[PDB]
Amino acid sequence: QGERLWQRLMELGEVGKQPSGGVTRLSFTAEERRAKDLVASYMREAGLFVYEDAAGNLIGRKEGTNPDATVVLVGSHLDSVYNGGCFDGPLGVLAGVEVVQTMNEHGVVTHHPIEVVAFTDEEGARFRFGMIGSRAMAGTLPPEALECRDAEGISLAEAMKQAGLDPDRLPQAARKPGTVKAYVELHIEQGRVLEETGLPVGIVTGIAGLIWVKFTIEGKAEHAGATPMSLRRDPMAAAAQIIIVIEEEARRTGTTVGTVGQLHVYPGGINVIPERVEFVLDLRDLKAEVRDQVWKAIAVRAETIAKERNVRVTTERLQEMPPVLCSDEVKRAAEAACQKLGYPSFWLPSGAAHDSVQLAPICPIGMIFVRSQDGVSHSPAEWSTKEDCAAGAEVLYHTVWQLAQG
Amino acid sequence: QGERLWQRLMELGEVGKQPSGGVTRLSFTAEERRAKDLVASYMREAGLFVYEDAAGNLIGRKEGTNPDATVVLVGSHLDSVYNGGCFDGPLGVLAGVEVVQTMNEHGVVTHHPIEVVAFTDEEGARFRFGMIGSRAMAGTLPPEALECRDAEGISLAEAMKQAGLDPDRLPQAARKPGTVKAYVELHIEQGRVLEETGLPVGIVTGIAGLIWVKFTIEGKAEHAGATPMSLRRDPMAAAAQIIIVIEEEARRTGTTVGTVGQLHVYPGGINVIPERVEFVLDLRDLKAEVRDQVWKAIAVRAETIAKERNVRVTTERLQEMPPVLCSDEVKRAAEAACQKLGYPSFWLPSGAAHDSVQLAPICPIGMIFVRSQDGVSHSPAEWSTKEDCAAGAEVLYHTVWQLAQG
Ligand SMILES: C[As](C)(=O)[O-]
Ligand SMILES: [Co+2]
Ligand SMILES: [Co+2]
């Protein structure tokens, strides 16, 4: 049941496998190269036409009955984070291949052509800049990104150069709007929503909007013994209260996620009230108006907490990504796909960002989620079951088939 | 009186004066010598018998009317930390000298002899070991610290031989529980309590008792975007609430202070709900029982929160120290000193230990604090006003006077 797909996942999982069992494949390395060629051999087996674009993106084309028809794109990525799993990335790609090759084996024809794409560098690990391949196909790679360097200090442009890739030709990788019918990506959930409901497959409603705000809280460093409670300007105590406000305000909507996952304290002694505490709100929600409305509540409540406790709080916005709603054509297709196959229709937002987010400016997008065991992602523990991947490939298949009809 | 004290503080404040801004006066060095010879010189001018003990403490005796009577001790320290102010230490030693000399110049004799003392190495900067002098006199100088080594690697013992002080003749510095009637020290507050009250002076009640307890809070590391508020098990959020609780409970008594001044998050990512948080609670009160009561109250609420949030909290006592009170005899004396001069008496704990702690076994002890500008200390920003200093010294005068009566 979903053998070929599972066998390919296990096999690809060997490429850059660590002693941990996890994987590490950075862009523009021999390992991702080995991976790209391995996936490419699966693309040939499926009867696809194989090429790489100007951004290093790997593509398999299956012609439709109208060579001039607009393209249905299915992909995901091959690169990983450092000690990553072997499902985040390849599921989408390998299921993509699985979908077309099934079609060719059973002599199934489609009006539109279907391209399976493995995008260059979604996770962003090597140059700390993410989603290089998909921005490129979308035509929104900033030249600021070419100047990013890795640990060994080689720049993206330099890496690209070494790889045979003239950064000058990067615009050639772009697809113009209206050459693409749509884009669909099968991905593991990366959370426990689906495992908690007890279902293998969900439909993505969209990719949540995001904000990173850095909180800097300034007080007065002072010896603990010397400083009565009534006199203090304790910014760690201030931080603790704000972190609670964050939780209260994210819980309130039923829809939002809010997290403080990093927090530095200055100076950092056991017996010293801190001078400064810095931390970063990670705050997301599918409706931007809700996200910001949530942020306003945190801001207003923080402002008073500041004045009450005689400390200074400045915030800075580090990153903003607007939400991307999934399209009705893709969603309606995945729903039909499930009903046909006897799966319940389960809707859910994608908290994390994906290559799909970078394709919205140029075509309608959509996504399908596969149950994630214990929600684990980006580590060796990452696991989706063979049958669950099977479930997701059937749906993908029937979602792609629909979209590629006239 | 007032002016003579000030001129001396400055004269002395030049002795280890660093282009850095502060004072570096480490024990058994050329800079210490220059500083004792200097104060020794003021002492000789005061009309005192002057000597150094076998630990290098500097004594100026004003003979009492009963030469056999018990000795009233009056001191502080001449040495410093690396980039220190010129009031921490001197103020006491120079104010003490001011007292006796003012007495001599006026017609003043007291039943008990008075000795001004300058303790060698209270800050402990040279050897990781502090209160060498005061311990030596109290009889509690461990033979293990003869082994303690310099940054240049010289051993305490070798530094004393160098200064021509026989380490074997150390026990001779000691004095009986009988030998000494009382000990008083005038010190800068080293805190803002007097500043915010509006007062130049105050009477130290003791040092608080102290516990350090490590909390380790464990939940589940998961994707911050993909995990809904209603599924996560967030150790930071939990920790934040324990930290608030710490504050709520130290505030409740009026007398307790509780401090979190370091906080480690694991793994550390802006988009990762943490797996673990670790922080250390510094908790202090003058009455042990009353702090012990605050720890129970914290610990229980912590447990209650652990259970509610489904996370794991493990507490761990790192260190425990008892309070040490200042004796009523000295306290009554300072009390009387303030009433005589028209100063309201104001009580406060000292944040730090001083030479007087090391004196508690052998006699009644007490201290007087003077207002510190902005609480700042142990740096060159360290400042006390001429007026404030005079005020302290005048209070010290009549304190010493009352304690020297038969
Ligand atoms: C790039 As992500 C794992 O924060 O959506
Ligand atoms: Co991914
Ligand atoms: Co001192």
UniProtKB/Swiss-Prot annotation, chains A, B:
<feature type="binding site">
    <location>
        <position position="187"/>
    </location>
    <ligand>
        <name>a divalent metal cation 1</name>
    </ligand>
</feature>
<feature type="binding site">
    <location>
        <position position="88"/>
    </location>
    <ligand>
        <name>a divalent metal cation 2</name>
    </ligand>
</feature>
<feature type="binding site">
    <location>
        <position position="353"/>
    </location>
    <ligand>
        <name>an N-carbamoyl-L-alpha-amino acid</name>
    </ligand>
</feature>
<feature type="binding site">
    <location>
        <position position="123"/>
    </location>
    <ligand>
        <name>a divalent metal cation 2</name>
    </ligand>
</feature>
<comment type="similarity">
    <text>Belongs to the peptidase M20 family.</text>
</comment>
<keyword id="KW-0479">Metal-binding</keyword>
<keyword id="KW-0408">Iron</keyword>
<keyword id="KW-0533">Nickel</keyword>
<dbReference type="Pfam" id="PF07687">
    <property type="entry name" value="M20_dimer"/>
</dbReference>
<feature type="binding site">
    <location>
        <position position="190"/>
    </location>
    <ligand>
        <name>an N-carbamoyl-L-alpha-amino acid</name>
    </ligand>
</feature>
<feature type="region of interest" description="Involved in dimerization">
    <location>
        <begin position="206"/>
        <end position="323"/>
    </location>
</feature>
<dbReference type="GO" id="GO:0030145">
    <property type="term" value="F:manganese ion binding"/>
</dbReference>
<keyword id="KW-0464">Manganese</keyword>
<feature type="binding site">
    <location>
        <position position="271"/>
    </location>
    <ligand>
        <name>an N-carbamoyl-L-alpha-amino acid</name>
    </ligand>
</feature>
<dbReference type="GO" id="GO:0050538">
    <property type="term" value="F:N-carbamoyl-L-amino-acid hydrolase activity"/>
</dbReference>
<keyword id="KW-0170">Cobalt</keyword>
<dbReference type="InterPro" id="IPR010158">
    <property type="entry name" value="Amidase_Cbmase"/>
</dbReference>
<feature type="binding site">
    <location>
        <position position="223"/>
    </location>
    <ligand>
        <name>an N-carbamoyl-L-alpha-amino acid</name>
    </ligand>
</feature>
<dbReference type="InterPro" id="IPR036264">
    <property type="entry name" value="Bact_exopeptidase_dim_dom"/>
</dbReference>
<dbReference type="Pfam" id="PF01546">
    <property type="entry name" value="Peptidase_M20"/>
</dbReference>
<dbReference type="GO" id="GO:0042802">
    <property type="term" value="F:identical protein binding"/>
</dbReference>
<comment type="function">
    <text>Catalyzes the hydrolysis of N-carbamoyl-L-alpha-amino acids to free L-alpha-amino acids. Is strictly L-specific since it is inactive toward N-carbamoyl-D-alpha-amino acids.</text>
</comment>
<dbReference type="InterPro" id="IPR011650">
    <property type="entry name" value="Peptidase_M20_dimer"/>
</dbReference>
<feature type="binding site">
    <location>
        <position position="77"/>
    </location>
    <ligand>
        <name>a divalent metal cation 1</name>
    </ligand>
</feature>
<protein>
    <recommendedName>
        <fullName>N-carbamoyl-L-amino acid amidohydrolase</fullName>
        <ecNumber>3.5.1.87</ecNumber>
    </recommendedName>
</protein>
<feature type="binding site">
    <location>
        <position position="88"/>
    </location>
    <ligand>
        <name>a divalent metal cation 1</name>
    </ligand>
</feature>
<feature type="binding site">
    <location>
        <position position="284"/>
    </location>
    <ligand>
        <name>an N-carbamoyl-L-alpha-amino acid</name>
    </ligand>
</feature>
<feature type="site" description="Necessary for dimerization">
    <location>
        <position position="232"/>
    </location>
</feature>
<dbReference type="GO" id="GO:0050897">
    <property type="term" value="F:cobalt ion binding"/>
</dbReference>
<dbReference type="InterPro" id="IPR002933">
    <property type="entry name" value="Peptidase_M20"/>
</dbReference>
<keyword id="KW-0378">Hydrolase</keyword>
<comment type="subunit">
    <text>Homodimer.</text>
</comment>
<feature type="binding site">
    <location>
        <position position="378"/>
    </location>
    <ligand>
        <name>a divalent metal cation 2</name>
    </ligand>
</feature>
<dbReference type="GO" id="GO:0016813">
    <property type="term" value="F:hydrolase activity, acting on carbon-nitrogen (but not peptide) bonds, in linear amidines"/>
</dbReference>
